């Protein structure tokens, strides 16, 4: 739901896999278990928790308070029923569905948000219900269930972009676009950060900036950064919060690897141990390394091992297998030679290859018109 | 309507009286004319609907449409009940 139990119950990923940080997460998880009816979530995740000595103590009180508030919402729902009104029943069934989102059961909340989803008098409240399914779909990490109601609720708005409704939906677009590895279309989502604000429901503003600094810092090139973020004053405002981000932006834009590799361990450790950002930690590292190697190797034709080893601050034995794996695996530039122990590329990728970029569509289009010949007579 | 009633002596005519909107007729028209624009979650439609007397239901439309301009002037995201009270003072002053 929109309560802090989304984040407190969202720390279960770092509570589960590492055994070092599993103390504070169970500290504020057990301390916060008396809030927002956290019984069923931590009872389901009880295998990743402590023993049953203190566990069975509060279950008897939470299981009866759940039934008490549940039957009070049922009595209030019966008092709202059989009466002339639309928003009253929407608030009763919607509040019952919010409590069922607090307990963490999407069966009665699925049929509840289905009933109040069918009682939507307007499309705005319908999109509000959709968002009410997205706030729990983040915890449930479902793929299609959160894209179905947004695919259906996306079209036919006709009421214009609000200040926090459309902006909040764009925030959700940033969420599911951070989950997926789509970057060239997700680089446009965070442009509305001027109107964004501290949203305790899903993600804090500093966490939204901390999450978009990866897709913006890696998924964008130097003209894209200079146009979008360097020209914009937003990163100039939010760089004063943490001095590290300014180092990872001015050091990357300044092409200083001696400090970027010494400070990259913080990006490595911080990159993992996250709810939605951990399983993609392998792609950001390699993509950023090949992006930096294409950045330095773009303006440089030939490169000696001395200036390269001093620039990157690493041994030649490692860059040997690096470029050796990035010739075939990376496929960044032409073949490299070591007849003089000097990185020397040619890159004839403009004159003839600029015309040869269409031969792939010529061969695939050739097989597609062979398919067109296959449609003949049958 | 007097001359028309002299020409229409209730022979074949549906006589439905059109009264000024009552309290509930101000809550429901306040909702129909409040869903179109922003609205906070800490407002009570009961008292703010009971504080809109006068001619007819177009006075509520005067509060809303003559309150969005104060939302624009104030440069806020939504509209509070105090702004609606200011629009009440405005349309009541105009009355």
């Amino acid at each position: 739901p929109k309560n802090p139990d989304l984040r407190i119950a969202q720390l279960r990923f770092l509570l589960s896999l590492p055994e070092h940080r599993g103390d504070a997460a169970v500290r504020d998880e057990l301390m916060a278990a008396v809030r927002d009816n956290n019984m069923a979530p931590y009872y389901e995740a009880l295998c990743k928790s402590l023993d049953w000595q203190i566990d069975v103590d509060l279950l008897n009180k939470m299981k009866k308070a759940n039934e008490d508030e549940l039957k009070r919402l049922d009595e209030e729902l019966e008092d709202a029923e059989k009466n002339l009104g639309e928003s009253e029943i929407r608030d009763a069934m919607m509040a019952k569905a919010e409590y069922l989102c607090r307990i963490g059961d999407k069966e009665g909340a699925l049929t509840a948000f289905r009933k109040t989803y069918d009682k939507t008098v307007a499309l705005g409240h319908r999109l509000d219900i959709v968002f009410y399914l997205l706030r729990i779909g983040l915890f449930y990490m479902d793929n299609d269930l959160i894209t179905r109601n947004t695919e259906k609720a996306k079209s036919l708005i006709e009421e214009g972009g609000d200040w926090d409704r459309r902006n909040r939906l764009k925030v959700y677009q940033g969420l599911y676009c951070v989950a997926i590895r789509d970057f060239k279309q997700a680089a446009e989502l965070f442009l509305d950060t001027v109107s964004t604000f501290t949203s305790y429901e899903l993600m804090d503003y500093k966490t939204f900036v901390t999450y978009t600094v990866y897709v913006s810092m890696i998924a964008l090139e130097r003209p894209d950064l200079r146009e979008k973020v360097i020209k914009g004053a937003e990163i100039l405002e939010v760089l004063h919060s943490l001095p590290a981000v300014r180092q990872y932006l001015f050091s990357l834009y300044e092409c200083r690897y001696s400090v970027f590799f010494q400070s990259l361990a913080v990006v490595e450790q911080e990159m993992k141990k996250d709810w939605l950002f951990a399983p993609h930690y392998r792609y950001y590292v390699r993509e950023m390394r090949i992006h930096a190697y294409s950045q330095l190797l773009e303006s440089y034709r030939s490169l000696t091992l001395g200036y390269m080893a001093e620039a990157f601050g690493v041994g030649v034995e490692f860059i040997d297998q690096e470029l050796s794996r990035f010739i075939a695996a990376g496929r960044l530039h032409c073949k490299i030679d070591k007849v003089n122990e000097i990185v020397e590329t040619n890159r004839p990728d403009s004159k003839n290859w600029q015309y040869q970029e269409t031969i792939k569509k010529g061969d695939l289009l050739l097989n597609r018109v062979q398919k067109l010949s296959r449609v003949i007579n049958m | 309507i007097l001359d028309s009633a002299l020409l229409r002596p209730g022979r074949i005519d549906r006589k439905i009286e059109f009264p000024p909107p009552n309290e509930e007729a101000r809550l429901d028209i306040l909702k129909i004319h409040s869903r179109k624009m922003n609205l906070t979650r800490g407002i009570n439609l009961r008292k703010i609907a009971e504080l809109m007397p006068g001619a007819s239901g177009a006075e509520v439309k005067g509060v809303c449409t003559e309150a969005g301009m104060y939302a624009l002037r104030e440069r806020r995201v939504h509209v509070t009940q105090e702004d609606f009270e200011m629009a009440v003072a405005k349309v009541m002053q105009k009355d």
Binding site: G161 | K36, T65, M69, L72
Partner: peptide, 28 residues
């Protein structure tokens, strides 16, 4: 091929003019 028409024309005319999509985001 005053101040009533200056304030009224002011806020009703030039304030919507110097901003875009306000017709969409003011409750048209």
């Amino acid at each position: 091929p005053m101040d009533i028409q200056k304030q009224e024309v002011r806020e009703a005319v030039e304030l919507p003019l110097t901003h875009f999509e306000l017709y969409k985001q003011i409750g048209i």
